[model samples]
Target: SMKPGRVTNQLQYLHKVVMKALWKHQFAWPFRQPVDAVKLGLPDYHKIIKQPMDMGTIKRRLENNYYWAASECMQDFNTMFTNCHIYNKPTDDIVLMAQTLEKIFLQKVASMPQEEQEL
Candidate 1:
């Protein structure tokens, strides 16, 4: 088994990878089209590296970044929802529900180790 710190680092790195990939695939196209990169206020790489690595903070940053990207895309929530449906197999409702549940479970699992360490 991996050491606890290493395991934590792995999870954080995985989150960063996923966030970066999603931003590239889902957001980059629209962002580049109009060249509104400045308005997006994306973090400078050096500044971002100094930020805390906690999951909650990372989650918030990613969600906020995506929110801006989505706005820039000028697509309504429903449109994006449908797009995601096309990308994934099952019914949109099922996939959305599963995603929500999985995120909650993973967040809880990630927090448990910190909680135990504090006790």
Candidate 2:
């Protein structure tokens, strides 16, 4: 009964598990939604960060089956953290919170099956 589709589907499920864990963390609030640069008066956010990522965007992409492998999904999460570093101060609460969340996410990802570590 083993097949490639089975592997892909299982990996998708596992990716969701990691995503949910991050979302449930107390430090996950600032990353839950996209930064509203204009409304928030952060005029340079878009300019500074080449590509922005957020938990909601990642969730939607995962739901839409946009990621073909665990690595791609993981990359988006890393990008989310990098965006925080690029636009926020090291001592800022948002940056600090994101660092914690990133550590949690990486740990969960590390525990995934070796076969699912890459495409």
Candidate 3:
């Protein structure tokens, strides 16, 4: 059951709308549009090269230039989440819960090898 403080009609419905918007490339302005390229395998991740400090540069290169990095770590988040949802996962719940859906990804990062956990 959802908690009283966290659950709301707006938040409950916003995730799917935003996810679709991100996938369809119209959630925000042009720069804020979703990245279309890149795919994550079924838990079979590719080698990660560098840590991303500048998301805009990396994202712009992938979408604007259509460059595929061939690595799971380089996958765009919007695409990744949407792809996973279509492949196997349930819809992603936004960060409105006290426990928050944030923990799922956070836990994975926390368990990563120290050097690979930059961002």
Q: What is the C-alpha RMSD of each candidate to the true structure, in Å?
A: 14.6, 4.8, 18.5
Number of clashes found in candidate 2: 0
What is the total number of backbone clashes in candidate 1?
A: 0
Q: Across residues 3-52, which tens digit of lDDT does each residue of candidate 2 receive?
A: 12223643665556788798888988888899899988999888899988
Model 1 stretches astray by more than 4 angstroms: 1-91, 114-119
Q: Score residue 83 of candidate 1 by CA lDDT.
A: 36
Q: Candidate 3: lDDT over CA atoms?
A: 0.31
How well does each candidate superpose onto the true structure, as a TM-score? Answer: 0.21, 0.84, 0.20
Residue-level lDDT of model 1, residues 19-53, one tens digit each, is: 34433443233321221225755445234233212
- In model 2, residue pairs whose N, Cα or C atoms come closer than 3 Å (at least 3 residues apart or on different chains), thus clashing, are none
lDDT (Cα, tens digit) per residue for candidate 3, span 1-119: 12122322222222233223332332223223322325423242222322222224434443343332222323444343333334332443311221232234344334433332211
List where candidate 3 sits over 4 angstroms from the true fold. Answer: 1-94, 97-99, 117-119
Looking at model 1, residue 118 earns an lDDT score of 13
The lDDT for every candidate, in the order shown, is 0.35, 0.76, 0.31
Q: Which stretches of candidate 2 lie over 4 Å from their true place?
A: 1-10, 117-119
Better-scoring candidate (TM-score), 1 or 2: 2
Candidate 1's TM-score reads 0.21
- Whichever of 2 and 3 has more TM-score, that candidate is 2
